[PDB]
Design a protein around this ligand. Structure first.
Ligand SMILES: C/C=C/C/C=C/CCC(=O)[C@@H](O)CC(N)=O
Ligand SMILES: C/C=C/C/C=C/CCC(=O)[C@@H](O)CC(N)=O
Ligand SMILES: [Mn+2]
Ligand SMILES: [Mn+2]
Lengths: 334, 334
């Protein structure tokens, strides 16, 4: 009758399976810079924006014309193995990538068709820049908590190959302005890869990691979006951490890991300083994989798992700031 | 303890407000045909595919470069007035259109920023071809039923102006093949427009229309998709009507209206015949507005409302078949 923060938390929702795919091809920032050198020389700009402002030494790309749906499909096959269940158990499949095969049909339907989902499986895509995987986890959690389904897949395949190709094209053209070139460099911090998660009703999966849910705040006055964006982003995150205290009971020192969406080395450094977070609890892959958009969060969770970095009882914070602006923060208990 | 169909229905979810926008400009199929006449003459094709196979006399377009987000915003302002609430009450805003301003940020965030949502409002886009508005209604319903929010907006603005422009360009070119021209004609059954709905917890809105929820079936083996598509579509719909009997208790003769997504005159005629539905309970706008994608369903519901066509207690079926293939069917009680 009297509301409490903890009442909105999911009680009966778990993670049965989790997998990621690293894209295979390394492209170093040194190789990109050689290609860009004469637009750099031409513009009278002497700074290595990628290596030294962004802090990206390399990113991963696909070796071939891999569609979003292909990479999600591959990640989804692995997470099913990880969970030890067949595709027939899946009642819901949500695709959360920014990369998309077509405006029609949804990417989710293509992935589902690849996996051979049953006729009872509901499917759709969610789009919300870099926070969508956490939005799809939440969506599936509600259906699970209610009993509408027993098992869900949340998938995300990202591909940036064509982005890099169109981008390096404009940036190495005699024509190009500084204001333009500068906008374009940020496309070069993106990376490729994929992740998938099998979520389930906790009674069907006893002792699996528990998905508690989370909180979202927004600052859509700034949907227009530079130097400003870091500041507004931190201010939104401060307010989401308050919400997270009110619902999840978070204080920073009680969390065992922060799985953070990452934009750049300086953006991450500022976030971490501003909230007093110990950097040893912030696994980072941006410097060699780049920004994998909404897949980043689950990829980093899956890497933590693979390295045996997580223990029963570990409180794990999933968070990011995304375009909109939006900020979400959720908790897993391993 | 023993599951029953009715257990999955939402008990506490209502429609507080509903509005639509008709796009202003009429483009007749006769005017399009004059432009296409020499590709028709050239191809040795003597049939008016638009007027006589599709059954579309006209469609509506925007008079200017209206973005999806602009049309959703306008529809959303009207549905708030209809509901008599201010934007501060809104805890969730989902955008469901196929049309999209950018791959980033979500269209939802742009709409929310336009309306001036508060910092507590969660936002994201759902994409699922023509069924997404019903998917967004369901998503919001779950959050409402649980008490996470009190009010939600589900919005959808569609724009086809650029589709028509690129399409009529390829179709009137000496170059063009029949197989190509034939693919392209179907883009010419699309229309523009928008809709928005305010959903709320039923205790906050006593006596408003009730959203019970619904069912989905899929046939994602056919995500590859002609003449076949009508048949597979009917077969999927048959199976969804079974699910709807099992959950909602539907029989065809007990429903007062069918608000059906519409693809074409013959597609609709076949659906209606195959299920024995009385055509007088199928309001249709396709012949003068064309296919408004996922906005079609709410637009037709809103038109029914406006005409005073609905009575307290009326059982209203919302349905469509969408790419994937997917089929969903949900019930409103006015
Ligand atoms: C410290 C945070 C600053 C906010 C920056 C947000 C930029 C977001 C991006 O452009 C991508 O990484 C992901 C995204 N679009 O959500
Ligand atoms: C009788 C049904 C036949 C199935 C046809 C589906 C075509 C769907 C479309 O192409 C659009 O109208 C909407 C959509 N993509 O969902
Ligand atoms: Mn290689
Ligand atoms: Mn006009």
């Amino acid at each position: 009758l009297v509301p409490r923060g903890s009442h909105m938390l999911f009680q009966n929702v778990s993670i049965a399976g989790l997998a990621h795919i690293d894209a295979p091809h390394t492209l170093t920032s040194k190789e990109i810079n050689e290609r860009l050198q004469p637009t750099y020389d031409r513009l009278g700009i002497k700074t290595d924006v990628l290596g030294d402002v962004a802090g990206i030494h390399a990113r991963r790309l696909w070796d071939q014309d891999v569609q979003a749906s292909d990479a999600a499909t591959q990640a989804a096959r692995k997470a099913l193995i990880d969970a030890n269940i067949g595709i027939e158990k899946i009642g819901l499949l949500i695709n959360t990538s920014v990369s998309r095969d077509y405006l029609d049909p949804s990417t989710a339907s293509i992935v589902s068709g690849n996996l051979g989902v049953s006729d009872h499986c509901m499917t759709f895509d969610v789009a919300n820049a870099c926070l969508a995987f956490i939005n799809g986890m939440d969506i599936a959690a509600r259906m699970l908590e209610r009993g509408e389904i027993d098992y869900a897949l949340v998938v995300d395949g990202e591909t940036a190959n064509l982005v890099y190709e169109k981008t390096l094209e404009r940036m190495t053209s005699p024509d190009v302005t500084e204001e333009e070139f500068r906008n374009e460099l940020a496309a070069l911090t993106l990376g490729c890869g994929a992740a998938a998660m099998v979520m389930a009703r906790s009674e069907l999966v006893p002792d699996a990691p528990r998905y508690k849910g989370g909180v979202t705040r927004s600052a859509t006055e700034w949907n227009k979006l530079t130097r400003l964006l870091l500041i507004e982003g931190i201010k939104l995150a401060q307010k989401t951490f308050v919400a997270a205290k009110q619902v999840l009971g978070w204080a920073v020192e009680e969390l065992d890991q922060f799985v953070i969406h990452q934009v750049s080395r300086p953006h991450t450094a500022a976030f971490v300083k501003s909230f007093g977070i110990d950097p040893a609890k912030v696994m980072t892959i941006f410097g060699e994989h780049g920004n994998i958009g909404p897949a980043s969060v689950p990829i980093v969770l899956s890497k933590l798992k693979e390295l045996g970095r997580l223990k029963k009882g570990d409180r794990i914070a999933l968070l990011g700031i995304g375009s909109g602006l939006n900020c979400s923060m959720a908790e897993v208990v391993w």
